[PDB]
Amino acid sequence: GAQQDAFVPLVRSMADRLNTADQVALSKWDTGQPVYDGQREAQVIANAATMASEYGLTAEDAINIFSDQVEANKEVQYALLNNWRRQGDAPATPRQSLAGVIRPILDKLQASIMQNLQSVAPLRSIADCHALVASAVGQVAEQASLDVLHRAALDRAVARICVK
Amino acid sequence: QDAFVPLVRSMADRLNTADQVALSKWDTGQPVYDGQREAQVIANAATMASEYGLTAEDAINIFSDQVEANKEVQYALLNNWRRQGDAPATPRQSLAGVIRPILDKLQASIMQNLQSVAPLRSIADCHALVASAVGQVAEQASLDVLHRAALDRAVARICVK
């Protein structure tokens, strides 16, 4: 059970990162900006690569992990936007500044995700890694009352925690 | 009379092969992500693009979105099954006999449907029409929340400014 808990702080940090998708979707609903931005996504992933060595990660590992993070985030954004498009309106949740609020959150979580990856480095090649990660996603989704969409995209985000 | 329904239906048909592929990977332990296999699926679409009047870049984007949507379903299914503790007892269709030929035929179906609605992909109401098409197809084909969300991912770049 100690092992079954060991991935929970890492999965929690990815879940916190995933949840910014709700506020980025709102902003893109207001402005009409597209979900995908190739240039910005490439800089996000390259930044991860640059910081990887500070946490004992290889550049390729960080790239895979954060490519997974940005794809899970887009999964949520595309689904929310089309959900709202089908109803004709988006929730009235107050919008948080993308540059002033969401960007610092994503910056802190880049470090916390990498710090957590480093902390759990021993168990990433363990035989039951897939089962443990899947259980951690279950626990975090229960704790955080994530809905089906967000749990599905959390499963996308944790895709390459486990490595052969 | 939502002109994007046929196209979204062919994308849903391709998407729903994820259930069988996920079962195969449960059995074999192969990862969801195969870099060289995915690159070849995308290259195959680039090869066929001009036959349907599509640019290579447009075909690449559309089928990049198809493969990402398929992986989204596979990852969630596999982790659902792990959390449950087993995969469905469904018979597995063979990759060489059934899955790969289906996917090959659906590439052509998707591209033919894209070509037929080319003039509409840039009209102002395209996003709304595609969204309504996704909802219609999901109800008619019994797609749950996971499969509808990934269908929203697949249709991502039908509309082009």
Domain encompassing residue B62: 1-161
Structure determination technique employed: X-ray
Q: In angstroms, rounded to a whole number, what is the distance separating the alpha carbons of residues B42 and B116?
A: 21
CB atoms within 10 A of CB B154: 27
Nearest by Cα to B68 from B144, B14, B105: B14
CB-nearest partner of A149 from B132, B149, B157: B149
At B124, which CATH number? 1.20.59.10
> What DSSP string describes A97-142?
PIIIIIHHHHHHHHHHHHHHHHHHGGGGGSTTHHHHHHHHHHHHHH
Q: Are B10 and B106 in contact (CB under 8 A)?
A: yes
CB-nearest partner of B83 from A75, A138, A152: A138
State the resolution, in angstroms: 2.0
CB atoms within 10 A of CB B86: 8
Q: Are A73 and A156 in contact (CB under 8 A)?
A: no
Residue A149's contacts (CB-CB under 8 Å, 6 or more residues apart) are A76, A79, A80, B145, B146, B149
Q: Are A137 and A155 in contact (CB under 8 A)?
A: yes
Q: Which residue of B has its CA nearest to A127?
A: B29
Q: How many domains does chain A have?
A: 1
CB-nearest partner of A79 from B68, B128, B152: B152
Structure token digits, residue A65: 């992990």
Contact B83 A135 (CB under 8 A): yes
Contact B72 A148 (CB under 8 A): no
